[PDB]
Design a protein around this ligand. Sequence first.
Ligand SMILES: Nc1ncnc2c1ncn2[C@@H]1O[C@H](COP(=O)(O)OP(=O)(O)OP(O)(O)=S)[C@@H](O)[C@H]1O
Lengths: 681, 40, 268, 123, 319
Amino acid sequence: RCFLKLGEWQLNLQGINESTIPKVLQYYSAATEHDRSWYKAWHAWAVMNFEAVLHYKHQNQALSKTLLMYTVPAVQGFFRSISLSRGNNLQDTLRVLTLWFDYGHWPDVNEALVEGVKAIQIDTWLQVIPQLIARIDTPRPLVGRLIHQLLTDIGRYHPQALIYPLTVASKSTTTARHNAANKILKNMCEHSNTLVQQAMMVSEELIRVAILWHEMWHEGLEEASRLYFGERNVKGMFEVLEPLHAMMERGPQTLKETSFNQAYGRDLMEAQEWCRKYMKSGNVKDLTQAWDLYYHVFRRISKQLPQLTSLELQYVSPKLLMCRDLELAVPGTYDPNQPIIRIQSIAPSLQVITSKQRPRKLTLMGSNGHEFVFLLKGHEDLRQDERVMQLFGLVNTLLANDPTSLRKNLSIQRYAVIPLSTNSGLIGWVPHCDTLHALIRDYREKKKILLNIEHRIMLRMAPDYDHLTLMQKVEVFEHAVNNTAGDDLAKLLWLKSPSSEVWFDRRTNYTRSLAVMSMVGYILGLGDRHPSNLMLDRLSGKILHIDFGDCFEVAMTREKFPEKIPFRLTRMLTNAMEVTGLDGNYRITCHTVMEVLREHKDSVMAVLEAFVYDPLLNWRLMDALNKKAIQIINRVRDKLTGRDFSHDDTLDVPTQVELLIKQATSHENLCQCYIGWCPFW
Amino acid sequence: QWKERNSKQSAQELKSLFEKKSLKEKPPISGKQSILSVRL
Amino acid sequence: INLQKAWGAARRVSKDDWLEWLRRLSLELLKDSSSPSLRSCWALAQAYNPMARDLFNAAFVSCWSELNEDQQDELIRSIELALTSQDIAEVTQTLLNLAEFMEHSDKGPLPLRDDNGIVLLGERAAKCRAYAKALHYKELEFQKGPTPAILESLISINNKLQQPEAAAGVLEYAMKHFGELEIQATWYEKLHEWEDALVAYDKKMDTNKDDPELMLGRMRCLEALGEWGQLHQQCCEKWTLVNDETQAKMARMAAAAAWGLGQWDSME
Amino acid sequence: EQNQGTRREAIRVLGLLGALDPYKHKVNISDYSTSEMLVNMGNLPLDEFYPAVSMVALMRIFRDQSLSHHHTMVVQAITFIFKSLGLKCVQFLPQVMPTFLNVIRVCDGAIREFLFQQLGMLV
Amino acid sequence: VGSDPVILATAGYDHTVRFWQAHSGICTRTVQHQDSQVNALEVTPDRSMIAAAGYQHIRMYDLNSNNPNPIISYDGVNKNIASVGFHEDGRWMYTGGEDCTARIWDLRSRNLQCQRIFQVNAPINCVCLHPNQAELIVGDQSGAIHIWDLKTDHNEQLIPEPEVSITSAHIDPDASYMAAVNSTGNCYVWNLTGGIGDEVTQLIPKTKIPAHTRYALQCRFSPDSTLLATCSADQTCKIWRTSNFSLMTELSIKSGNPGESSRGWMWGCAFSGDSQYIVTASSDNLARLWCVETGEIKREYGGHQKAVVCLAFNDSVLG
Ligand SMILES: Nc1ncnc2c1ncn2[C@@H]1O[C@H](COP(=O)(O)OP(=O)(O)OP(O)(O)=S)[C@@H](O)[C@H]1O
């Protein structure tokens, strides 16, 4: 204990330099030899070794001998400390994965890696299945072979935990990725063949219901027209709409596809013929007719999209309603410590939600007689929601291991996210929740209050509102919020309560679930929190956030309407949490969550580093290549160290929280938000 | 409209092209406020 | 109309008398209600009383919707007398539930003496140990005009509702919205902010020596803080030249201080 | 209990076990529609609010087997409600019919030949 | 028409530019300005035309003829134009834009090219020409004050208080002080250039005037350099003295009832040649004319149907 304290204190006193590293290392090694059964000592030693590797790499980027000397014992100590926890070792696993991916090709690190992989148990990898599959197509032989062996072992022992992402990665466009996934899958059919076939069928079958043929063609033409008429990129529209012609010449397989081929099939062939004639002999006179046909088909398709409000399985996918039994587990619900729930049946009718993306409402029927309702999403990449859900689970386990946070029941509400492709997926359905917009809307349509009264007052005091300067918009916003008593949420939440005890409990839960989510979204960088992305649980009062598409402060640095607020804290959300203000449960819960997140900055930092550094997921954050991601993680390292508002000082939790409060509830920041964000609510 | 790349190379010419450094009217005098009194 | 002999009898004395009055009231209210459902259920309610208790609000509102102005005013006076006359839990809970059911409707709450009696219903629910209703009524009273008494009652109510954070928020509001140092040291005592209460009592005594309950609060802060030395030192120099109605309250603190210091000769 | 010796022994055992903090106690450890109806949270108009609360009050008595003495008046009131309403008494079937059939199944004696009869009236 | 020694005009959100004269408060000509709001307008030193700047365009309106249309319009910027002004002889027009730029323009239809650009990392809020037509002060949304001299190509940067956006700045015509206000009411007063010889542009902070609890919208000196008027979001306009910088006079449009709830701010103000009668533009759909001594209003012009955020008042040199 004294050696560990001495090492930590020297680290806090003199930082990480070329003279204190060996001293702290010898202190930590002495502690490990003195205890040899202590998780803290091994963890501290491994973290010091990893930090030494990081420092010596960052120093020589502004030899491969010192790096090895510090990374071999890093892997050794990390594999040693993984076995000491056995209940929560996510940070250690992510760190060994980082070392594996960065220096696993060296002949010396590979020995420790192959020793550790067989040393530790097989369950400690079920938590890092995504981060593994994201590197399955690595161009190096040793790390690739070790990854393939590990995935084969996981599939042999736990086949249900690896089948969905494997069949997702198999249907890719990259040669190496898809052939490696196919190799692992065909190696998986040795001990379990019916499961792999059923999974392939189901995955390929409800990926067809997600986006029908006419929706695919509508999206493709809407993209290709923009591309060609804004960038003059014929070689872009060609590769955009060639896969559509390719999938259309393999024959329709359902009644919907046959009807589409009968209706629009003739024009889409002559259009391809004209495009081919043009690409043979370059002449825009041949592309104009192709675009005439394409635009006619597009205009005929776009008129029948609002009419789509329900889907029959006999018409759309005749193979999904003829299952009646399956060996697959219900998506999103599988844990190796519980009896698995199998997919028994699928309802023969889906309801399409009238929106801009039209998400279907799938509802399976498990083997235990319980209905599992899902949301089949198209035109969207669900690979970021999975990572943010993993982060939220980590934060939940962190808040559960805290005495003051456990007695107050602080936790984030999550839902299942099962991606099926790069532009399709399946989101779990949360019941009893209703949107914040769909609550004020009802309360106002019932109380005879018009919905846009504040926007109408703003447009009446000034017609060109969105063109005023900062001070004029501030004055208009203040006049609109002063001439309107905004307390619809408080009265709406009290009116729907049976008694006063239930109302009080619901209000307490609402406040202490809003505060934790505000702090977590600030640490993550959640944006676009308009009233349609926040839901209230009508039975417990808790708050649910959705649409995790704009993370890492992307919405703050965009070009049109950049938001200047860390989180959403408006007058309607504040008038419904207490009678005094946000200085009671809100501020105390913010302090608690922020100090818990700052005490455990290493775990969340490792998760966010594994998220951002993924080369196949960091395309939204760059709207060299590895220079932007750096200046993102650094930003996070400021948020968790109180160095985000100014680098010449270090703020504590009270000062940082009060500054965040003053920034989120400032009229000068709310006056600049887009009118659809509803800054007056 | 607006066009850039103007007078980006002549330093000695820009030293007196538009910066006349006109500083005068040091002596202030009193008045009777003709227009103000006429309006009132 | 035929219930004024059940409402306005002006003869209730004991708790059993109030119970029988409530029973007869619910029965005569369910008998004639102009609704076939309640009138048919009255025959069973005559034999089973909990059913007549469960159907009290519906019968009350059905009968109230048809009364005139003077009849409903006499009704309001009678229910006010029934509220402020007894102290038992059954009829108080019944009347509070009726008031909540009436304020949850579309016609608004039934008018009490002044502004739906949020001051009477609040103080009647505070002694009934229904603190959620008391907090709701205190918040309704705060929404009109905030005063230090309302903030102190909010602190007191949120303390017994196991909500110290709400009470701290109330103190913060009183501190950043009043600005005259009117926050009494008892407010810091209730929040268990013993250091702040101690410095407040020090700032209140150093200007002038005042009557008792200003040194007893300081002694309470010193005791709950854990300083036996200063507590015994301040108690010894004032144990003699003090009256009788203060030693009876300071004796337990003196004994605790002497025990913490080990002075069993003075502890005895 | 009222005997003071037993109360003293109970508080003695309580002190000997010893001051468990409330969180450890809470760790060691539908029915919502009746609360929505008794307070009229659905904001049903007063015209069609008395039938629903009368039905739930009668079902509270008709549900338990211990209080099987006034069941005849319960079914009489239920039949009277169903007859007086008219064609709008269908919304109360999913909550009334299951308990009715369960009572018919578990009851006994000369009330059964009565219940069936009343059941016919419902049909 | 503008054939008069004194002229004054207002502009606002009602898509009109009103001209009138302080004889009876009656409008003479109402010029049509549409599709945008007017941030600020300024008269040409030769008293031939006016120029109103708003949202990516500066529109000039003839004063001699009777024309309701923008004879000359300037385009090219992408955001609002906060303030505009011309050289004392009508040679170059300095326009501070909202986005990031403070630039100059050439008013001659020839390839003169005396136009330059000054770029800062913060949105501009105010520009103020030096009384010698050589320097120019820029005030942006980051509390920074960029004193940029047209002689050289380097500009000094001064921050009285960061994280607060300054709103206006002005220099008295006698070049005695230099004042500025920010979005919290503070009014710093640095001593301007005293080295008339070679433009040393030395700055020493004299004093700070703590007033205007609400936002401070604009501060302006007097042509006599004996007064300084500043308007705030608290519906007040305070005129201070230049000897001890005390509160000389205070004017307000508050009705004294809690039923209005800040019905209108005091956006702009201007002095007269005699430094005796000032004009104020409030958000009460009207403008007022006050005396610096008697306190009470002297006149009111109420022809507008929307707010009024900018006004121009020019008078003869005599006064
Ligand atoms: N996870 C969920 N659980 C329960 N309901 C959900 C869930 N997710 C979405 N919903 C509901 O489905 C509605 C529409 O789904 P969305 O996908 O949000 O529509 P959308 O507008 O196309 O989405 P974007 O990306 O914000 S445009 C949501 O607004 C909620 O009403």
